[PDB]
Structures are given as C-alpha cells and as structure tokens.
Design a protein around this ligand. Structure first.
Ligand SMILES: [Zn+2]
Lengths: 182, 225, 298, 208
C-alpha cells in the first residue's frame, strides 16, 4: 500500500457529474470495442478559485505502452488543449483520470508525466467493477516525500463534494428517473 | 558537485536581484537533489520558503506556497508557522513577523518609500483580506488594533484595496466602518442545509464503518415498513 | 441488453448510407435517441452560454427510422441565430476535432447540430430552417436539436426538441398536433412564418449499465442538492423578462378588444398561467425546505 | 481530535496515579484536543476520582461537560490553569452557547467568558475558528456572533435520550412533509381528471 497516508492538503474539490458520465462512457465504449474491460485514461478540466478546485469537464487522452510502462502522448494533449481553449476559454487543465482499484505504481509513473504539463495535477480514479455500496470515485493529490534517503512521489486522498448546478441537477435527475404540473 | 555549486550561486544571485519567485523555484529544485546533503537540502528549502514569502503576491507565488505547504519537510523550518498561516489565509501578528524578519538577510528587508518594507505592506494587505473572511463588518479603530496599525492606515489601505478590486466591500466614513462582502440571506440558508445533510451522510457512513452489523439489522427494518 | 446500442458497426452504417431510405420518404426519420452523456453535455454547454445562443455538433448514427446521438461538442462560432450556416466558420475545427476523436476511439461521425434558445423555447427560426435545409441537402442524414437552458431550470423539466426540415416546395400531410409553447413577441412573427417548414421528432434518452449503477450511487449523496436548489433567484431575471413580454402581449390583446391574432387574450392567459405556475412551484420547494429544516426547535 | 486520541490512549493504558494526574494537565494544555470522552471513561482515570487527585478529575469533568463560569465558581477547589487552558475552556463555552442558539450577542459572551473588552472576545473567536472548533462570522455593528457550525463536546450517557427526542421530532417532521406531498399530488390529479370529465360533458352537449 505505497501512498502518503498522512496529513491533508487543499481539501476542496467540487466534482461535476458530467465528468463521471464522461469517464463511464469512455470505459463502456472501449470495453464495447475490445470485448473486455480496458483501462481508460483522460484529462480533467475546470476552474481553480484559490484553494477551491471545480472539476467541470473531461476528455479522452492518447497513450502508448513502451514495454510495460504507460506513456502519455504529450503532442496530442497540446493539440487537444488548443482545441478546448476555443470553446471553454475560462477553463484550465486540472489533472487526469483513469479506471481501476486503489492507486498503483503505473498511476504514479503517469502522474509524473502529467506533472511535466501542470504543477499540481489532481488524480481521479473510477472503479467500474466495484463490489461496494458507495460511489466508486476517489480523488488524490501528489506529495513528494523522503523515505530512507529516496525522494519519492506518493498520493494523498482528498474528500470531494458533488456540484450544485441547477440545470445539471435537473438533467441528472431526468436521466436517473427515465419514465398534472404539480 | 561544482555544477550544483553553480546552481546554488545562480539561485543566490536571483535572490540578491530580488527575483524571488524565480529564486524560490531554483532553491526548491535544489532541495530535491539526493546527491546534496540533507542539511543543505533543508537550507535550500528554507531559502525557497523565505523567497516565496517575500515574493510579489500572485498566482506563481500562491502555487509555490501550495507546493511548499505540501512538502512535509517544511515542518522542520522555523518559518513553517508563517507559511501555514498565509496559505490558510490567517491573520499574521506583529510578533510572528518580528521573528521572521530576524530570519532574513539585510538585502531581503528592502524598503519602498518612507522606511516601510514590501513585506510590511504585503502582510497588512494579507491581514486585511484575511479579516474580510472573519467579519461582516468592522470599525477602523478595531481593525487597526487587530492588524497592529493606526486606524487611518487601516481605512486608507482598505479603501485602496477596494478601489483596486483586490477586496470586495464598502466603507462608511461617518460611522467609521468597513463592510465586507456578506453573501448572506437565502443562498446561505441553502448552503447551511447542504452542510447539515452532508453531516447526515458523514454520520451514516461512520455508523456503517464502525458498526456494520447494526447498520444491516436496522437497514432491513426500513424495508419491513 | 442495455449496452447493445453502444456497439458501432461501421459496415452496417456504410450500408445504410449507401441505401439512403430517407430519399423514399420525407417523414422517414421519426425518432431521436439521445445518450445521457450528450444530453448532459448539450444542456451544460447551453447553460454556459447564459442568455447568448451557442451551438455545437452532434456525433452519432442511424438505425431504421431512429437517429441516435452518442456525443456532442461545442463549436467556436459567432452568429448562432443570425448567420445562415454559422457552423461553416468552424469547418476546419470540426475536421480536426473529429480526427483527434478518432485517435481516442470515438468512431461515430456527424449526425447533426445542436444550438440553444435561452428563454424563448424549442423551435426553428428562419435562419435555423435555412441552415437545416442546407444540411439536409448536402450532409444527409442530419438532425437539428434545440435546447432552452433557461426554461429547463424554471420548469424543472428538460426543454429540448429535435427537428427535421421539409424540402423546398414539399407540403406536410394532414396531421400536426403541435405541442404549445409560449413564444415572445420579438420571435413570434418569424416562428409563425416558418413553423410548417419542418417537423418534430419523438425524443427519447438512454444510458449504459454502468451509467445506471453510477447514477444510483451518485443519488445516495446528490439528494442533498435537491433540497438546496434555490431556483427562484438563480434565474430570476427570466420570469421578470417574461412578465415584461406578457405585459406587452396584454397591451396587444387590449387593442384587439378596442375596436377590431385568433384571440390574443387566451394566449396571454396561458402564458401568464405558465409563468405563475413555475413561480408557485419555486415557492413550493422553498416552503418544503422551511418545513423540513426550520420548524424543528429544541 | 483523532490522532491525539490514539496517541494519548496508548499512554493512558500504560500510566499510573501521578503519571495520569499529570497527563490530564498535558491533554488539557494541548492544541486540537477538545473532546475527552474516551479519556474520562477510562478505569485508570476512574481510580483518581474520590482519591488523592480528585480535583484533577473534577477539572476534566468541567472541561468535558461544564463551562468557564462553572470553573470560576469552583476555582478554589479546582487546580490552577494557564492562559492556554483558560482559552480552550472559553472556546468550549462558546461552543455550548452556539449549541443553544445560532446568533450570540457580545454581552452574553463577555459575561460567560469573563472578558472586559470586545477585541479580546473577537480574538478568542478567531482562535476558535483557526483551531477548527467553530465556523461563522462576526458582526460588529449589531454586536453579534453569527455561528455557522459548532462541534460536539458533551457525551452525556444519561441525557443521550434528548438527542433522540430531537431526532424523532425531525423524523415526524419529515413524515408530515412526505404525507403532505402524497396528498397534494393526489389532489392535483383529483382536480385535473374531474375538470377533464366536466369538459367532456360540455363537449357532449355540442351535438344537441
Ligand atoms: Zn435557433
């Protein structure tokens, strides 16, 4: 269980449910194409107001595997950024997402690559094969610590709330319900 | 080693040039180098922290404050108190600044006009903004007393910050009171309801975590009704 | 199988595009299936425009008489609602977006365009009709989706329509119920001129098995947001704007009674009813909140 | 508190009379430790009650249940406290006031915490908000403290029922609101259908 497991950080992440559906759809579509569950990876965009981070949208990222390690295509990201900046001018790259269980060495390797793009990226993990009764979404920050003389990166989990957008609430409710004025 | 000695010198030159955010970044990077002795890595971190505190207020400085606050090693530094307090938007006392000012080199105590230092003024402005988060409104006499400045200066700087758009509020000069952006009424009621129901969810999750047996036993009773 | 619709069959799509059954019938396409993802993204984009019209492209496919929308994306264009084929200015961007989408496994191609009508209902204006007629002439199969984000919020129900135009010269058949919407006086003339040049598709929504699971688990915490909505002040300016319009409508209905279009007062009465009913529903949620959290004591 | 609970419970199970008596003076003079429910319920600290260090147990009882005024009334019996401990007990007294009412006037605070000027009180409320004990905002003009959130201190085994007495009072409240909707919705249909029916009668008289 190699991660931080100590003091809290920013602790102000507001997540929009659009992002959860984006990631679900990404995983469902890749699973449909390959006929088996596939780990999917992408970018998280939104706003940062001081220590409050608002995760508003997301998009799929391109990657390759060199031997056994996952490499994010950085040229693809910068191209995608030039494209999302035209329609979401007020939004910024906040971090990345992937699917699976608790964080692992591969997630740290990729997180370091994302750290080459932005200073303090968030990491969101979604478990589409959950056995439990709580929403299988977790958010993490990275901390850089020294253990036995080795300066290493670890994840620290952050608590998060769901967004309070009225139109989004009605949309989500309408989707969840799927069927007089009063 | 010689290459690292240059890098240290380069950071020091930036420090001495008052390029504090750039110096802080270079010092911070030096603090990560495992080939450098632990004591000197911390000296580098301390230099990064001091330069970040002294840096001009803004996004790059705030991002570095966040980077340093996430670094557990900063808790071994005497200035951690100050770091934490500004990162968390807390009011910094004269006494705490006195000690920090004693931690600085002469060149780092640079003064703009009539003897007043950049840091003196930055701390007042930080404290004004921090006070705006504690109060809905406050008198200039009290605000001055809390910030350890004359009441006229508290009014003048508050007035400047409001005009400059760095603080939201308005001033009543006859009653001698500054009013801070309250954001009260009905939206606050909705936010308090959210806090209450979030407390409800946390309480249910903690009941299920600490005792799942009774949680299931009482969960079946809801379906029985 | 809930997830069967997510399977993309390229050859089957090519076969349908080679067959072109829509050329045999101008009422061929009757249904519009929209993914929960595309709905949410379009409503979120529409709300993000505020009181200004925005537009985007929809990615999807066809299946018999049904048009399927899988995804959508915003276009960085000016002149939505004023420029015919405003989307054309984003041609280059559309080509690159789709190219990049194909790199990450988005296989569905352009199926239509969406745009917003903030506070003035779902229908096609003259400009919209010209745009959709162009799209159906050169880009068929294509559909036009219109969303009112403002009315979605005020009514607490999603305000969306899917439309297809008739070719120049072609007349619709006998049956046209036309579900009534309040149209403001600055838009009603153009609405009336073009309302018979297109038809509305039957809209339905879908989500995946995982979406289903995740939305139930989201609800286990998202219920808090339903008891803290505050809808009366979020978009207040809308109801005050509608009342202004209602007042001018009533002025015209008074002029109709003066000396001497088909009963303007009844229309205005249904408008005032709708606006008031929305307002009272807002108060209903506020009173419910007051009953639950304030009237408790020690 | 959370870390300090385990950290001092580890020492509590491995300590004797005098060491526990001094440990009480160490837990009360430590930042973040505002709840002493697990520490007061220990058998090791139960031995100190009615013994050589009884006033220290009474001091722990005041810090876990009572207020600063209760300490002032029994200051001759209770052991002396430093400014940090006096502050902490004042913070907890403000929490008790905030548990009673949402908007606390300065007068009630000045009288309950035994303070002379307004800034002392304002600085104590700042120290409270900064130690994550209270949440809220101060109003100077109306001389009132607006409390947004206050933590739980008193455990109260005997008075626990009162919590349920309010919880049920909320439950019943919900049970009314729910039923209300069920009825109103029903009425909203009961009218609609009726009206439709009536319209269908009027429309049937057009043929005549
Ligand atoms: Zn339009």
């Amino acid at each position: 269980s190699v991660m931080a497991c100590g003091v809290t950080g920013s602790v102000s992440v507001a997540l929009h449910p659009l992002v959860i559906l984006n990631i679900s759809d990404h995983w469902i579509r890749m699973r449909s194409q390959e006929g088996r569950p596939v780990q999917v990876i992408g970018a998280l965009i939104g706003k940062q107001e001081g220590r409050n981070i608002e995760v508003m949208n997301s998009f799929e990222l391109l990657s390759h595997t060199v031997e056994e390690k996952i490499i994010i295509d950085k040229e693809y990201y910068y191209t995608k950024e030039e494209q999302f900046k035209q329609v979401f001018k007020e939004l910024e790259f906040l971090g990345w997402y992937t699917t699976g269980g608790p964080p692992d060495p591969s997630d740290i390797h990729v997180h370091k690559q994302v750290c080459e793009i932005i200073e303090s990226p968030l990491f969101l993990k979604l478990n589409p094969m959950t056995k439990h009764t709580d929403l299988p979404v977790s958010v993490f920050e990275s901390v850089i610590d020294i253990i036995n003389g080795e300066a290493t990166m670890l994840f620290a989990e952050l608590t998060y709330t769901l967004a309070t957008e009225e139109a989004e609430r009605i949309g989500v409710d309408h989707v969840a319900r799927m069927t007089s004025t009063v | 080693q010689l290459q690292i000695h240059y890098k240290v010198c380069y950071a020091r030159v930036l420090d001495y040039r008052r390029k504090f955010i750039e110096a802080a970044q270079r010092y911070n990077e030096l603090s990560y180098k495992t080939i450098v002795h632990e004591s000197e890595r911390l000296e580098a971190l301390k230099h990064a922290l001091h330069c970040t505190i002294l840096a001009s207020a803004g996004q790059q400085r705030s991002r570095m404050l966040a980077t340093l606050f996430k670094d557990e090693r900063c808790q071994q530094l005497a200035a951690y108190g100050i770091l934490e307090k500004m990162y968390l938007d807390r009011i910094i006392r004269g006494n705490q600044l006195q000690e920090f000012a004693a931690m600085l080199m002469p060149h780092q105590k640079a003064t703009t006009a009539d003897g007043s230092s950049i840091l003196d003024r930055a701390v007042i402005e930080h404290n004004l903004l921090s006070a705006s988060k504690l109060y809905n409104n406050i008198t200039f006499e009290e605000l001055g007393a809390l910030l350890e400045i004359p009441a006229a200066k508290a009014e003048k700087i508050a007035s400047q910050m409001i005009t400059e758009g760095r603080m939201n509020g308005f001033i009543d000069q006859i009653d001698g009171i500054v009013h801070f952006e309250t954001r009260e009424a009905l939206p606050t009621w909705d936010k308090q309801i959210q806090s209450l129901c979030f407390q409800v969810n946390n309480l249910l999750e903690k009941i299920s975590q600490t005792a799942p047996e009774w949680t299931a036993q009482a969960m079946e009773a809801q379906m029985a009704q | 199988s809930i997830d069967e619709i997510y399977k993309y069959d390229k050859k089957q799509q090519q076969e349908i595009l080679a067959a072109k059954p829509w050329t045999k019938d101008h009422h061929y396409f009757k249904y519009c299936k929209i993914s929960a993802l595309a709905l949410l993204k379009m409503v979120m984009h529409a709300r993000s425009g505020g009181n200004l019209e925005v537009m985007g492209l929809m990615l999807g496919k066809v299946d018999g008489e049904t048009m399927i929308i899988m995804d959508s994306f915003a276009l960085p264009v000016e002149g939505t609602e004023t420029r015919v084929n405003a989307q054309a200015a984003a041609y280059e961007y559309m080509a690159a977006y789709i190219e990049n989408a194909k790199q990450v496994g988005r296989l569905e191609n352009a199926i239509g365009w969406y745009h917003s009508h903030p506070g003035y209902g779902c229908w096609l204006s003259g400009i919209d009709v010209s745009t959709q007629m162009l799209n159906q002439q050169f880009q068929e199969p294509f559909v036009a989706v219109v969303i009112d984000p403002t009315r979605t919020i005020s009514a607490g129900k999603v305000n969306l329509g899917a439309f297809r135009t008739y070719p120049k010269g072609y007349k619709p058949p006998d049956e046209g119920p036309s579900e009534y919407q309040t149209i403001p006086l600055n838009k009603i003339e153009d609405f009336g001129v073009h309302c018979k040049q297109y038809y509305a598709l039957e809209v339905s929504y879908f989500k995946s098995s995982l979406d289903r699971k995740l939305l139930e688990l989201l609800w286990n915490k998202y219920w808090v947001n339903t008891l803290s909505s505050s809808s009366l002040l979020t978009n207040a300016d809308y109801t005050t704007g509608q009342v202004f319009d209602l007042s001018e409508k009533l002025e015209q209905s008074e002029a109709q009674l003066g000396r001497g279009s088909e009963d303007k007062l009844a229309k205005a009465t249904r408008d005032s009813c709708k606006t008031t009913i929305e307002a009272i529903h807002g108060l209903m949620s506020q009173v419910i909140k007051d009953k639950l959290f304030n009237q408790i004591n020690i | 508190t959370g870390q300090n609970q385990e950290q001092f419970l580890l020492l509590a199970k491995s300590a004797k009379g005098a060491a526990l008596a001094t440990l009480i003076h160490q837990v009360l003079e430590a930042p973040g430790v505002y709840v002493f429910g697990e520490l007061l319920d220990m058998p090791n600290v139960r031995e100190l009650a009615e013994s050589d260090f009884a006033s220290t147990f009474r001091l722990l009882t005041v810090f876990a249940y009572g207020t600063y005024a209760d300490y002032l009334a029994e200051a001759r019996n209770l052991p002396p406290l430093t400014e940090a401990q006096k502050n902490k007990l004042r913070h907890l007294s403000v929490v008790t006031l905030a548990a009673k009412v949402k908007c606390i006037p300065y007068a009630v605070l000045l009288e309950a915490l035994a303070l002379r000027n307004v800034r002392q009180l304002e600085d104590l409320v700042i120290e409270a908000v900064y130690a994550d004990v209270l949440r809220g905002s101060l109003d100077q003009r109306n001389q009132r403290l607006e409390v947004d959130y206050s933590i739980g201190r008193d455990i109260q085994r005997q008075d626990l029922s009162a919590i349920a007495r309010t919880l049920q009072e909320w439950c019943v409240g919900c049970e009314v609101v729910l039923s209300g909707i069920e009825e109103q919705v029903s009425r909203a249909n009961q009218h609609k259908e009726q009206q439709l029916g009536l319209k269908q009668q009027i429309e049937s008289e057009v043929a005549n």
